[PDB]
Design a protein around this nucleic acid. Structure first.
Length: 325
RNA sequence: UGUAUAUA
């Protein structure tokens, strides 16, 4: 039954600022009504605060629906300056973790919508667009899927915007995830080579093979394989190709591409180059385990090219370990 | 020997 207003100005410490929280941990069924009707005026710069967001974060766990909606309405006109902030994003993230109504949600989506692309590129913005994916219903977060679908290639090829795409494939709809993948698959040339998008391509495959249910993986391979050698020596592509190798339902046809079309030449290229090198080692490693004979047929066009300085290098030393297993 | 993300 304690005391003290003035709460507000405790919000400048980290101590009297971690105190208001000490106060609600052991409370505040009726105390977070106080704090509320007080701080409800500084919520925006409390959110963007180095210690203020903490109180806020916890304050929305404790507060009532009516009170959470009020805050949402107070912060809606500023979600952008909030999203782009180190602490703000973490307060705003929690906000979304708590929204329990198809109004709270329906308010956030109008506020975030005009700025979806923008916000997913931001170092701090993505983690909030990402959280809309995690916590919101699919009918709700639809706006994101549409925002992205439009700027498919730059969100896909973007330090930050790409992680968003992955998180869509993690939480979207078989309908949603599909129209997106039809947009992504039309650029898998550019996407496999890119330093970021080549992670997206791998994800598709990563995710289907969680489901054990393959639709795009095949379509991806059908488009790629023809250019197997070329991509195995490419700095980024060589990682997509290694993915396919590691993906059981596609290994063999890919290994067969290298044998068939990677000539005895194409395998020379794999041997000497800084990227192909690893492809070739993955090929040997798998086929050994995967296919009695493919290993053999391949492990024999290798054996004879391992002469000279090559036997010395880091990569040659490793390649030979593969050969008699 | 070869690729990407955030608070006291």
């Amino acid at each position: 039954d304690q005391y003290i207003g003035s709460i507000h100005s405790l919000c400048k410490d980290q101590h009297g600022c971690r105190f208001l929280q000490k106060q609600l941990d052991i409370l505040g069924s009726k105390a977070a009504d106080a704090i509320f009707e007080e701080t409800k005026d500084y919520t925006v710069e409390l959110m963007t605060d180095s210690f203020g967001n903490y109180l806020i974060q916890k304050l929305l766990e404790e507060v009532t629906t009516e009170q959470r909606i009020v805050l949402t309405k107070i912060s809606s006109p500023h979600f952008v300056e909030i999203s782009l902030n180190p602490h703000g994003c973490r307060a705003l993230q929690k906000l979304i973790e708590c929204i329990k109504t198809d109004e709270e949600a329906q308010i956030v989506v109008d506020s975030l919508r005009p700025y979806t692309v923008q916000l997913s590129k931001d170092l701090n913005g993505n983690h909030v667009i990402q959280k809309c994916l995690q916590r919101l219903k699919p009918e709700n977060f639809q706006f994101i899927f549409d925002a992205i679908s439009d700027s498919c290639i730059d969100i896909a090829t973007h330090r930050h915007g790409c992680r968003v795409l992955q998180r869509c494939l993690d939480h979207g709809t078989t309908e949603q995830c599909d129209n997106l993948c039809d947009k992504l698959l039309a650029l898998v040339d550019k996407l496999t080579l890119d330093p970021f998008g080549n992670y997206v391509v791998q994800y598709i495959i990563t995710k289907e093979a969680e489901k054990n249910k393959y639709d795009y993986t095949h379509k991806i391979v059908h488009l790629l394989k023809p250019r197997a050698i070329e991509l195995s020596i490419h700095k980024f592509g060589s990682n997509v190709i290694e993915k396919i190798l590691k993906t059981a339902i596609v290994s063999e046809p890919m290994i067969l591409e290298i044998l068939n079309n990677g000539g005895e030449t194409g395998i020379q290229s794999l041997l000497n180059d800084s990227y192909g090198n690893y492809v070739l080692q993955t090929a040997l490693d798998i086929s050994h385990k995967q296919n009695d004979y493919l290993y053999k047929r391949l492990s024999e066009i290798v054996a004879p090219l391992l002469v000279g300085p090559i036997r010395n290098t880091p990569h040659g030393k490793r390649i030979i370990g593969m050969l008699h297993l």
